[PDB]
Amino acid sequence: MRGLSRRVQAMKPSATVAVNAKALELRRQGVDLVALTAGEPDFDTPEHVKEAARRALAQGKTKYAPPAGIPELREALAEKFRRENGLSVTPEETIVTVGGKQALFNLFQAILDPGDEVIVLSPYWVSYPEMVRFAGGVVVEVETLPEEGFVPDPERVRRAITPRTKALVVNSPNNPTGAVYPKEVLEALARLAVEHDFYLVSDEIYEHLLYEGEHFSPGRVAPEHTLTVNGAAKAFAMTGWRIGYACGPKEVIKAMASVSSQSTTSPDTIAQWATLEALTNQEASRAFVEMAREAYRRRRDLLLEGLTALGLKAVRPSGAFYVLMDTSPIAPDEVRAAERLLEAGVAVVPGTDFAAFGHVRLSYATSEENLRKALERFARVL
Amino acid sequence: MRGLSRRVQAMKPSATVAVNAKALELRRQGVDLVALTAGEPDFDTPEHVKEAARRALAQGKTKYAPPAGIPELREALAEKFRRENGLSVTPEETIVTVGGKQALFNLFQAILDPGDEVIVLSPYWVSYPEMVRFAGGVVVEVETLPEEGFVPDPERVRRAITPRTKALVVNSPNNPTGAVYPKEVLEALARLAVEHDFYLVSDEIYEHLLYEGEHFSPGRVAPEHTLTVNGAAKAFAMTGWRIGYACGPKEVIKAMASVSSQSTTSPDTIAQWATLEALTNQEASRAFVEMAREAYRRRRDLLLEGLTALGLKAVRPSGAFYVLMDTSPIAPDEVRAAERLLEAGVAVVPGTDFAAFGHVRLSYATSEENLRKALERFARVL
C-alpha cells in the first residue's frame, strides 16, 4: 500500500504560515509592509569567512568530509568550547552538523525511544516539540512567566520530572523571549539532571548576542549529563551556510555522527573550511561580533523606548534579537492581533507556535529606519 | 534516565571499517597503498560551478532558503527531469536536499511505519538497509546474479511482494555492480508497483556516467508510484557540496519537505545557487560530463583488460565507476582477500556490506597510472 507514515502525518500546521500568506497577498496588491519577522541577522557574513570559502574553492576542497566533520574543525571546536565556554571537552566529543537544528534533530533520534519524555520550557522555539514528537517522544511543558522575566523557576521544572524523563531543553539566550538565564538558575537545572539522571540539552547559539549579564554553560558543572548545542548561524550571520556544532558525552556524540552518516553524510565541505576561519581568526570574528552587538543594542533600546511610550508591554530582553510584545490592547488574541498589524503595514510573528499566547514576537534585526516606521504604524493602530 | 535509543544501537558494524583500520596501520608504518576505494569522482568540480558560487558570495546569498529549495532551482529541476528523463513534473513536485542520501532518508521517514517492508536488490549500496531499518522498516532482500549480469528478474521480485510491501528500491546505473538495467526490466518493475500498489524508489545518480545502453527512468511509466532520486554529486564532481534532488507524487514531496524543515531547514544556499549553474549552463556542463565519461571509459577498459590477463573474473560494468571482482582465487572470502591485497599494496572495498560476498568492489575514479600500479601488485596474490 501507498500513503504517508504516521509520524509525518502528525505534524501540526503553523499559524505563522497562515499569516505569512496574507502578508504576501498585501505585498502583491502593493501594500508596503515593514517586516519585524526575521529569524536571522540582517548583516552579511564577514569577509574573512567569505575569503576562506574562496580559498577552499581554489584549493579544490570539494570532496566528502568525515561524518563528524573535518578533523581541523573538530580541534578548533574543542578549543572554542573550552576557551569561550569553560567546557572540558576533547576533539572526539565534538561534532559538526548541517546547522544547529540538525544537531538537535540527531540528538533526539539518538536518545529518544517512543514514550520517552522531554521537558520543554515555554515560550519555546517552534522546532523543539516537533523534533521530540518525530522521534516518538512525549513533550512535557513547563511554563515560564512574563512577571518572572521568562526565567524558569527550578521548582516548577521539578514538578514535571517523572521516571520517564529523558531530557530537559534549555535555551539561553532565548528565542522568542530574549531572556538570559542567571548562572544560579542554570546550575539548579543541572543539579536536577544529575539527581534525576537525565540529559540537559543546552541550546546556546545566541551566546554572543548578549547585552547584559554573563553567558554561563551548564556543561561546566555536569559535563556527562549535558549536550551543548551551538553553531555559526546567529553569531556570524551564517544562516545560509548550514553549519552547527555540539559537544557532550563521547557515546552520544558518536551516536549523533552515526545518524549523520545515514542521512546527510557530512555538512558541505567549503562551509566547514569557511567556519574554521571564523573560529581560528579570533581577531576578525571578535570585530564582527562587537559591531553586531553594538548595533542590536541600539536597536533594542530604540524599540523598547517606543513601545513603552505607547503603553505596549514587553519584557526587556537581555540577549538574541527578539522582543515578545503583549497584544491585549490590540486584539483579544495573537492571531487577530497579527492580522490587524498586517492591515496597518507591520508584519510580526504570532506567538501561537511558541506557546506565547497573547504575545507577538518582534525582531530587531532590521534597520533603525524600519524600526521607527513600525512604531509609527503601531501608534496608528492605537 | 540516560542512554541511547534502540534505533541507534540497532546499527550494524561495518566490514569496511576493519580493513580500513588495517590500511591506516599499514599507511602509518610508511607502506604505500594504491587505493581503489573511492566513492566519488577524482576530478575537481568544474570552473563554471565554482564561479557561480563565488557570485552568490559576492551577492550576499548567505541567508536561509525555503525547505524544499530555492525557487529558481526547483524550476530548473523540473526542466531537467522533463528534458533529460522524459518526466512531466512541476516545480512543486521537485525538492532540493542535502545530497541524494538525504532525499532517500527523508523519503523513508515520510513513508515507512514500523513493520513496513522495503524490497532491496542485492548487491546494494550500503546505506539502503540502514535507512530502512532506522525508520522502523523491514528489509526484504532480493538477490541479483552475476550469471545474469546482476540484472534483476521481475519474477524473483514478484515472489517477494507481501501485503506489507511499501517500497522497492531500484538503482541503475548500479553501485556497486556497475550494471545498467534495460528499459523493459525497468518497465516490468514499475508495473509490479502499480499492480501491487507500493512505491518504486529509483536512485538514478549515475545516469550521466553510462558507457553503453541507455538510461530509462521508470517514473515515465508509473509517475504516481515513483520517487526519482538524483543529485549533482557523481555527475559534476560535487560530492562535498551536498546537493541532491528528487521528484515524484506531490503529496510525498511535500512530506519530504516537512522532514527537512525540522532537521536541516534547507541545503546550503551558496551550494544551491552553484547547482543552478550546473543545471542551466548546458554547454559547459555537457563538456564536463563528456570529458569525464571518456576518461572513465578509458580507465574501465584498461582495468578490465588487466584483470582478464591475470585470470581474474568480474562482470563487465556499463555504468558508474565500479567493478565487482571475484575473489575466490585469492581467498575463501572477501574480507581475507581484501587483507591479502592490502599486504600486496592495494586497498579495495570488501563486498560484505553490499551483500556481495566473494567479491570486492574496485573503483576506477583514480588515474590510469594508479590503476596500472594496482594491476602490477595483483600479481603477488596469485
PDB file of C-alpha atoms in Angstrom, chain A residues 78-332:
ATOM      1  CA  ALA A  78      37.369  21.707  21.307  1.00  0.00           C
ATOM      2  CA  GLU A  79      39.361  24.927  21.800  1.00  0.00           C
ATOM      3  CA  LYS A  80      36.341  27.243  21.382  1.00  0.00           C
ATOM      4  CA  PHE A  81      34.215  25.269  23.864  1.00  0.00           C
ATOM      5  CA  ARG A  82      36.971  25.283  26.434  1.00  0.00           C
ATOM      6  CA  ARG A  83      38.215  28.854  25.868  1.00  0.00           C
ATOM      7  CA  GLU A  84      34.848  30.564  25.483  1.00  0.00           C
ATOM      8  CA  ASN A  85      32.610  28.275  27.460  1.00  0.00           C
ATOM      9  CA  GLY A  86      34.740  26.718  30.138  1.00  0.00           C
ATOM     10  CA  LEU A  87      33.750  23.249  28.834  1.00  0.00           C
ATOM     11  CA  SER A  88      36.210  20.333  29.329  1.00  0.00           C
ATOM     12  CA  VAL A  89      35.880  18.528  26.009  1.00  0.00           C
ATOM     13  CA  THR A  90      38.196  16.644  23.682  1.00  0.00           C
ATOM     14  CA  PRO A  91      38.062  16.843  19.840  1.00  0.00           C
ATOM     15  CA  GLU A  92      36.267  13.451  19.803  1.00  0.00           C
ATOM     16  CA  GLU A  93      33.491  14.942  21.952  1.00  0.00           C
ATOM     17  CA  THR A  94      32.743  17.451  19.220  1.00  0.00           C
ATOM     18  CA  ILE A  95      30.598  17.267  16.078  1.00  0.00           C
ATOM     19  CA  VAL A  96      29.836  19.413  13.045  1.00  0.00           C
ATOM     20  CA  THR A  97      26.259  19.331  11.681  1.00  0.00           C
ATOM     21  CA  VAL A  98      24.005  20.861   8.999  1.00  0.00           C
ATOM     22  CA  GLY A  99      23.012  23.792  11.210  1.00  0.00           C
ATOM     23  CA  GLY A 100      22.384  23.652  14.930  1.00  0.00           C
ATOM     24  CA  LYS A 101      18.909  22.333  14.032  1.00  0.00           C
ATOM     25  CA  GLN A 102      20.459  19.090  12.690  1.00  0.00           C
ATOM     26  CA  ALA A 103      22.477  18.702  15.900  1.00  0.00           C
ATOM     27  CA  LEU A 104      19.192  18.824  17.875  1.00  0.00           C
ATOM     28  CA  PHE A 105      17.402  16.505  15.444  1.00  0.00           C
ATOM     29  CA  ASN A 106      20.233  13.968  15.500  1.00  0.00           C
ATOM     30  CA  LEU A 107      20.409  14.212  19.280  1.00  0.00           C
ATOM     31  CA  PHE A 108      16.718  13.276  19.782  1.00  0.00           C
ATOM     32  CA  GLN A 109      16.933  10.449  17.207  1.00  0.00           C
ATOM     33  CA  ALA A 110      19.962   9.208  19.259  1.00  0.00           C
ATOM     34  CA  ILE A 111      18.426   9.355  22.738  1.00  0.00           C
ATOM     35  CA  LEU A 112      14.620   9.024  22.449  1.00  0.00           C
ATOM     36  CA  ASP A 113      12.674   5.796  22.312  1.00  0.00           C
ATOM     37  CA  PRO A 114       8.881   6.098  21.847  1.00  0.00           C
ATOM     38  CA  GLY A 115       7.297   7.104  25.168  1.00  0.00           C
ATOM     39  CA  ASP A 116      10.402   8.908  26.455  1.00  0.00           C
ATOM     40  CA  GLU A 117       9.614  12.305  27.967  1.00  0.00           C
ATOM     41  CA  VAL A 118      11.306  15.601  27.202  1.00  0.00           C
ATOM     42  CA  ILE A 119      10.713  18.710  29.307  1.00  0.00           C
ATOM     43  CA  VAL A 120      10.344  21.893  27.262  1.00  0.00           C
ATOM     44  CA  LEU A 121      10.098  25.441  28.745  1.00  0.00           C
ATOM     45  CA  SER A 122       7.501  27.690  27.069  1.00  0.00           C
ATOM     46  CA  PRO A 123       7.588  30.021  25.285  1.00  0.00           C
ATOM     47  CA  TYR A 124       9.796  27.744  23.143  1.00  0.00           C
ATOM     48  CA  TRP A 125      11.416  27.690  19.747  1.00  0.00           C
ATOM     49  CA  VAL A 126       8.829  26.174  17.392  1.00  0.00           C
ATOM     50  CA  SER A 127      11.109  23.297  16.401  1.00  0.00           C
ATOM     51  CA  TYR A 128      11.691  21.648  19.782  1.00  0.00           C
ATOM     52  CA  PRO A 129       8.262  19.957  20.236  1.00  0.00           C
ATOM     53  CA  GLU A 130       8.122  18.812  16.628  1.00  0.00           C
ATOM     54  CA  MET A 131      11.534  17.116  16.749  1.00  0.00           C
ATOM     55  CA  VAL A 132      10.707  15.462  20.074  1.00  0.00           C
ATOM     56  CA  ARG A 133       7.425  14.059  18.708  1.00  0.00           C
ATOM     57  CA  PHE A 134       9.024  12.978  15.429  1.00  0.00           C
ATOM     58  CA  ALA A 135      11.338  10.665  17.343  1.00  0.00           C
ATOM     59  CA  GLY A 136       8.371   9.167  19.235  1.00  0.00           C
ATOM     60  CA  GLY A 137       8.901  11.171  22.436  1.00  0.00           C
ATOM     61  CA  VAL A 138       6.378  12.912  24.711  1.00  0.00           C
ATOM     62  CA  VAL A 139       6.507  16.654  25.290  1.00  0.00           C
ATOM     63  CA  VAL A 140       6.058  17.801  28.930  1.00  0.00           C
ATOM     64  CA  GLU A 141       5.784  21.569  29.051  1.00  0.00           C
ATOM     65  CA  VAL A 142       6.799  23.804  31.936  1.00  0.00           C
ATOM     66  CA  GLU A 143       5.746  27.411  31.869  1.00  0.00           C
ATOM     67  CA  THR A 144       7.964  30.451  32.396  1.00  0.00           C
ATOM     68  CA  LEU A 145       6.182  33.686  33.339  1.00  0.00           C
ATOM     69  CA  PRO A 146       6.444  37.261  31.983  1.00  0.00           C
ATOM     70  CA  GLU A 147       6.401  38.596  35.576  1.00  0.00           C
ATOM     71  CA  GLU A 148       9.381  36.406  36.282  1.00  0.00           C
ATOM     72  CA  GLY A 149      11.005  37.757  33.137  1.00  0.00           C
ATOM     73  CA  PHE A 150      10.526  34.387  31.381  1.00  0.00           C
ATOM     74  CA  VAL A 151      13.252  32.825  33.584  1.00  0.00           C
ATOM     75  CA  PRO A 152      12.493  29.253  34.682  1.00  0.00           C
ATOM     76  CA  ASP A 153      11.666  28.553  38.309  1.00  0.00           C
ATOM     77  CA  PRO A 154      13.592  25.307  39.192  1.00  0.00           C
ATOM     78  CA  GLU A 155      10.756  24.212  41.494  1.00  0.00           C
ATOM     79  CA  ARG A 156       8.236  24.319  38.658  1.00  0.00           C
ATOM     80  CA  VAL A 157      10.595  22.211  36.494  1.00  0.00           C
ATOM     81  CA  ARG A 158      10.887  19.814  39.472  1.00  0.00           C
ATOM     82  CA  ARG A 159       7.166  19.013  39.246  1.00  0.00           C
ATOM     83  CA  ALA A 160       7.477  17.912  35.587  1.00  0.00           C
ATOM     84  CA  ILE A 161      10.087  15.187  36.236  1.00  0.00           C
ATOM     85  CA  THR A 162       8.844  11.578  36.117  1.00  0.00           C
ATOM     86  CA  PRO A 163      10.712   8.264  35.834  1.00  0.00           C
ATOM     87  CA  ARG A 164      10.345   8.519  32.023  1.00  0.00           C
ATOM     88  CA  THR A 165      12.131  11.873  31.840  1.00  0.00           C
ATOM     89  CA  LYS A 166      14.939  11.618  29.223  1.00  0.00           C
ATOM     90  CA  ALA A 167      15.948  15.206  28.663  1.00  0.00           C
ATOM     91  CA  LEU A 168      15.272  18.851  29.591  1.00  0.00           C
ATOM     92  CA  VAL A 169      15.794  21.525  26.887  1.00  0.00           C
ATOM     93  CA  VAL A 170      17.138  24.927  27.989  1.00  0.00           C
ATOM     94  CA  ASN A 171      17.721  27.819  25.548  1.00  0.00           C
ATOM     95  CA  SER A 172      19.595  30.871  26.868  1.00  0.00           C
ATOM     96  CA  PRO A 173      19.809  33.494  25.426  1.00  0.00           C
ATOM     97  CA  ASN A 174      16.198  32.623  24.486  1.00  0.00           C
ATOM     98  CA  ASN A 175      14.227  32.624  21.246  1.00  0.00           C
ATOM     99  CA  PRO A 176      11.432  34.030  21.416  1.00  0.00           C
ATOM    100  CA  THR A 177      11.788  35.856  24.763  1.00  0.00           C
ATOM    101  CA  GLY A 178      15.317  37.301  24.597  1.00  0.00           C
ATOM    102  CA  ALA A 179      15.834  36.336  28.240  1.00  0.00           C
ATOM    103  CA  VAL A 180      19.237  35.395  29.619  1.00  0.00           C
ATOM    104  CA  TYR A 181      19.095  32.945  32.500  1.00  0.00           C
ATOM    105  CA  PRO A 182      21.326  33.608  35.526  1.00  0.00           C
ATOM    106  CA  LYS A 183      24.041  31.074  36.384  1.00  0.00           C
ATOM    107  CA  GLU A 184      22.317  30.126  39.621  1.00  0.00           C
ATOM    108  CA  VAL A 185      19.199  29.014  37.692  1.00  0.00           C
ATOM    109  CA  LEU A 186      21.308  27.106  35.187  1.00  0.00           C
ATOM    110  CA  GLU A 187      23.285  25.394  37.980  1.00  0.00           C
ATOM    111  CA  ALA A 188      19.965  24.484  39.628  1.00  0.00           C
ATOM    112  CA  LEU A 189      18.690  22.862  36.405  1.00  0.00           C
ATOM    113  CA  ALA A 190      21.991  20.986  36.021  1.00  0.00           C
ATOM    114  CA  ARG A 191      21.637  19.603  39.592  1.00  0.00           C
ATOM    115  CA  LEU A 192      18.202  18.271  38.678  1.00  0.00           C
ATOM    116  CA  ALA A 193      19.688  16.376  35.697  1.00  0.00           C
ATOM    117  CA  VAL A 194      22.369  14.828  37.855  1.00  0.00           C
ATOM    118  CA  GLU A 195      19.944  13.978  40.683  1.00  0.00           C
ATOM    119  CA  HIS A 196      17.255  12.507  38.468  1.00  0.00           C
ATOM    120  CA  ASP A 197      19.639  11.151  35.843  1.00  0.00           C
ATOM    121  CA  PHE A 198      18.608  12.678  32.535  1.00  0.00           C
ATOM    122  CA  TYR A 199      20.235  14.786  29.823  1.00  0.00           C
ATOM    123  CA  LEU A 200      20.268  18.546  29.915  1.00  0.00           C
ATOM    124  CA  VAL A 201      20.205  19.936  26.330  1.00  0.00           C
ATOM    125  CA  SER A 202      21.637  23.472  26.271  1.00  0.00           C
ATOM    126  CA  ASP A 203      20.875  25.452  23.134  1.00  0.00           C
ATOM    127  CA  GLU A 204      23.463  28.212  23.249  1.00  0.00           C
ATOM    128  CA  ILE A 205      23.520  29.609  19.599  1.00  0.00           C
ATOM    129  CA  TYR A 206      22.809  33.210  20.778  1.00  0.00           C
ATOM    130  CA  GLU A 207      25.745  33.203  23.214  1.00  0.00           C
ATOM    131  CA  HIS A 208      27.464  36.168  21.510  1.00  0.00           C
ATOM    132  CA  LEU A 209      24.327  38.248  21.158  1.00  0.00           C
ATOM    133  CA  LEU A 210      24.367  39.371  24.799  1.00  0.00           C
ATOM    134  CA  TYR A 211      23.746  42.904  26.069  1.00  0.00           C
ATOM    135  CA  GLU A 212      23.816  42.334  29.812  1.00  0.00           C
ATOM    136  CA  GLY A 213      24.802  39.615  32.239  1.00  0.00           C
ATOM    137  CA  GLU A 214      27.079  36.631  31.522  1.00  0.00           C
ATOM    138  CA  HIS A 215      26.552  33.574  29.359  1.00  0.00           C
ATOM    139  CA  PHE A 216      27.007  30.533  31.592  1.00  0.00           C
ATOM    140  CA  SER A 217      27.204  26.992  30.116  1.00  0.00           C
ATOM    141  CA  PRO A 218      25.652  24.227  32.342  1.00  0.00           C
ATOM    142  CA  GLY A 219      28.232  21.776  30.966  1.00  0.00           C
ATOM    143  CA  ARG A 220      30.791  23.447  33.288  1.00  0.00           C
ATOM    144  CA  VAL A 221      29.277  21.558  36.198  1.00  0.00           C
ATOM    145  CA  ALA A 222      27.622  18.482  34.691  1.00  0.00           C
ATOM    146  CA  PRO A 223      29.592  17.518  31.540  1.00  0.00           C
ATOM    147  CA  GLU A 224      28.398  13.886  31.458  1.00  0.00           C
ATOM    148  CA  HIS A 225      24.727  14.961  31.507  1.00  0.00           C
ATOM    149  CA  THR A 226      24.939  17.949  29.178  1.00  0.00           C
ATOM    150  CA  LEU A 227      24.751  18.178  25.412  1.00  0.00           C
ATOM    151  CA  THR A 228      25.780  21.684  24.331  1.00  0.00           C
ATOM    152  CA  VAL A 229      24.339  22.860  21.013  1.00  0.00           C
ATOM    153  CA  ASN A 230      25.675  25.880  19.151  1.00  0.00           C
ATOM    154  CA  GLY A 231      26.592  26.982  15.608  1.00  0.00           C
ATOM    155  CA  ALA A 232      27.818  29.767  13.327  1.00  0.00           C
ATOM    156  CA  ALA A 233      24.393  30.906  12.044  1.00  0.00           C
ATOM    157  CA  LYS A 234      23.451  33.662  14.507  1.00  0.00           C
ATOM    158  CA  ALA A 235      26.795  34.997  15.782  1.00  0.00           C
ATOM    159  CA  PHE A 236      28.445  35.226  12.348  1.00  0.00           C
ATOM    160  CA  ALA A 237      25.451  35.912  10.097  1.00  0.00           C
ATOM    161  CA  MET A 238      25.891  32.453   8.524  1.00  0.00           C
ATOM    162  CA  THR A 239      22.303  31.148   8.433  1.00  0.00           C
ATOM    163  CA  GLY A 240      22.504  30.090   4.767  1.00  0.00           C
ATOM    164  CA  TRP A 241      25.795  28.205   5.250  1.00  0.00           C
ATOM    165  CA  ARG A 242      24.170  25.467   7.398  1.00  0.00           C
ATOM    166  CA  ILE A 243      26.962  24.818   9.938  1.00  0.00           C
ATOM    167  CA  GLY A 244      26.097  23.903  13.519  1.00  0.00           C
ATOM    168  CA  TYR A 245      28.172  22.157  16.203  1.00  0.00           C
ATOM    169  CA  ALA A 246      27.706  20.391  19.500  1.00  0.00           C
ATOM    170  CA  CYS A 247      29.782  18.800  22.271  1.00  0.00           C
ATOM    171  CA  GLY A 248      28.957  16.411  25.100  1.00  0.00           C
ATOM    172  CA  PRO A 249      29.356  12.789  26.296  1.00  0.00           C
ATOM    173  CA  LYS A 250      31.501  10.747  23.875  1.00  0.00           C
ATOM    174  CA  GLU A 251      28.908   7.941  23.464  1.00  0.00           C
ATOM    175  CA  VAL A 252      26.173  10.449  22.479  1.00  0.00           C
ATOM    176  CA  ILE A 253      28.357  12.426  20.026  1.00  0.00           C
ATOM    177  CA  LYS A 254      29.371   9.137  18.391  1.00  0.00           C
ATOM    178  CA  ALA A 255      25.748   8.088  18.025  1.00  0.00           C
ATOM    179  CA  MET A 256      24.880  11.533  16.568  1.00  0.00           C
ATOM    180  CA  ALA A 257      27.606  11.107  13.895  1.00  0.00           C
ATOM    181  CA  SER A 258      26.097   7.688  13.037  1.00  0.00           C
ATOM    182  CA  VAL A 259      22.771   9.391  12.372  1.00  0.00           C
ATOM    183  CA  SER A 260      24.507  11.962  10.119  1.00  0.00           C
ATOM    184  CA  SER A 261      26.205   9.099   8.235  1.00  0.00           C
ATOM    185  CA  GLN A 262      22.810   7.579   7.335  1.00  0.00           C
ATOM    186  CA  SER A 263      21.144  10.912   6.411  1.00  0.00           C
ATOM    187  CA  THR A 264      23.375  13.727   5.221  1.00  0.00           C
ATOM    188  CA  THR A 265      26.855  12.078   5.259  1.00  0.00           C
ATOM    189  CA  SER A 266      28.582  15.334   6.335  1.00  0.00           C
ATOM    190  CA  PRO A 267      27.945  19.107   6.032  1.00  0.00           C
ATOM    191  CA  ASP A 268      29.136  20.989   2.888  1.00  0.00           C
ATOM    192  CA  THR A 269      32.992  20.860   2.854  1.00  0.00           C
ATOM    193  CA  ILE A 270      33.512  24.505   1.767  1.00  0.00           C
ATOM    194  CA  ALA A 271      31.263  25.741   4.633  1.00  0.00           C
ATOM    195  CA  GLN A 272      33.314  23.650   7.120  1.00  0.00           C
ATOM    196  CA  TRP A 273      36.544  25.302   5.927  1.00  0.00           C
ATOM    197  CA  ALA A 274      34.924  28.749   5.998  1.00  0.00           C
ATOM    198  CA  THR A 275      33.724  28.090   9.587  1.00  0.00           C
ATOM    199  CA  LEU A 276      37.190  27.015  10.609  1.00  0.00           C
ATOM    200  CA  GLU A 277      38.360  30.580   9.740  1.00  0.00           C
ATOM    201  CA  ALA A 278      35.534  32.013  11.855  1.00  0.00           C
ATOM    202  CA  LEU A 279      36.892  30.080  14.819  1.00  0.00           C
ATOM    203  CA  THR A 280      40.637  30.468  14.216  1.00  0.00           C
ATOM    204  CA  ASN A 281      40.795  34.164  13.296  1.00  0.00           C
ATOM    205  CA  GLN A 282      39.542  35.451  16.701  1.00  0.00           C
ATOM    206  CA  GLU A 283      40.576  38.980  15.901  1.00  0.00           C
ATOM    207  CA  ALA A 284      38.384  39.355  12.802  1.00  0.00           C
ATOM    208  CA  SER A 285      35.429  37.430  14.365  1.00  0.00           C
ATOM    209  CA  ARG A 286      35.555  39.487  17.583  1.00  0.00           C
ATOM    210  CA  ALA A 287      35.400  42.667  15.445  1.00  0.00           C
ATOM    211  CA  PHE A 288      32.245  41.377  13.703  1.00  0.00           C
ATOM    212  CA  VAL A 289      30.531  40.257  16.944  1.00  0.00           C
ATOM    213  CA  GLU A 290      31.219  43.546  18.703  1.00  0.00           C
ATOM    214  CA  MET A 291      29.962  45.559  15.714  1.00  0.00           C
ATOM    215  CA  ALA A 292      26.758  43.497  15.533  1.00  0.00           C
ATOM    216  CA  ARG A 293      26.220  43.546  19.310  1.00  0.00           C
ATOM    217  CA  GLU A 294      26.535  47.323  19.498  1.00  0.00           C
ATOM    218  CA  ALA A 295      24.112  47.757  16.586  1.00  0.00           C
ATOM    219  CA  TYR A 296      21.482  45.330  18.097  1.00  0.00           C
ATOM    220  CA  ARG A 297      21.716  47.012  21.488  1.00  0.00           C
ATOM    221  CA  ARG A 298      20.975  50.429  19.955  1.00  0.00           C
ATOM    222  CA  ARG A 299      18.053  48.911  18.028  1.00  0.00           C
ATOM    223  CA  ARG A 300      16.691  47.143  21.116  1.00  0.00           C
ATOM    224  CA  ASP A 301      16.795  50.385  23.138  1.00  0.00           C
ATOM    225  CA  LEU A 302      15.076  52.380  20.407  1.00  0.00           C
ATOM    226  CA  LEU A 303      12.269  49.784  20.081  1.00  0.00           C
ATOM    227  CA  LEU A 304      11.730  49.437  23.854  1.00  0.00           C
ATOM    228  CA  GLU A 305      11.516  53.239  24.429  1.00  0.00           C
ATOM    229  CA  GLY A 306       8.908  53.465  21.702  1.00  0.00           C
ATOM    230  CA  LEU A 307       6.766  50.564  22.957  1.00  0.00           C
ATOM    231  CA  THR A 308       6.836  51.985  26.480  1.00  0.00           C
ATOM    232  CA  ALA A 309       5.723  55.394  25.167  1.00  0.00           C
ATOM    233  CA  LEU A 310       2.724  53.713  23.548  1.00  0.00           C
ATOM    234  CA  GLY A 311       1.914  51.787  26.693  1.00  0.00           C
ATOM    235  CA  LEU A 312       2.555  48.440  24.966  1.00  0.00           C
ATOM    236  CA  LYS A 313       4.131  45.843  27.297  1.00  0.00           C
ATOM    237  CA  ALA A 314       7.289  43.803  26.632  1.00  0.00           C
ATOM    238  CA  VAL A 315       9.759  42.138  28.982  1.00  0.00           C
ATOM    239  CA  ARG A 316      13.125  43.792  28.332  1.00  0.00           C
ATOM    240  CA  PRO A 317      15.296  41.220  26.507  1.00  0.00           C
ATOM    241  CA  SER A 318      18.935  40.649  27.551  1.00  0.00           C
ATOM    242  CA  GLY A 319      20.079  38.595  24.510  1.00  0.00           C
ATOM    243  CA  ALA A 320      19.298  37.470  20.961  1.00  0.00           C
ATOM    244  CA  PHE A 321      17.322  39.990  18.798  1.00  0.00           C
ATOM    245  CA  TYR A 322      13.675  39.395  19.738  1.00  0.00           C
ATOM    246  CA  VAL A 323      11.093  41.062  21.979  1.00  0.00           C
ATOM    247  CA  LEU A 324       7.752  39.422  22.995  1.00  0.00           C
ATOM    248  CA  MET A 325       5.045  42.116  22.913  1.00  0.00           C
ATOM    249  CA  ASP A 326       1.714  41.753  24.747  1.00  0.00           C
ATOM    250  CA  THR A 327      -1.141  42.232  22.241  1.00  0.00           C
ATOM    251  CA  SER A 328      -4.060  42.653  24.685  1.00  0.00           C
ATOM    252  CA  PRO A 329      -4.657  46.315  23.779  1.00  0.00           C
ATOM    253  CA  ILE A 330      -4.698  45.404  20.087  1.00  0.00           C
ATOM    254  CA  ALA A 331      -6.920  42.325  19.921  1.00  0.00           C
ATOM    255  CA  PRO A 332      -8.258  39.528  22.152  1.00  0.00           C
TER     256      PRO A 332
END
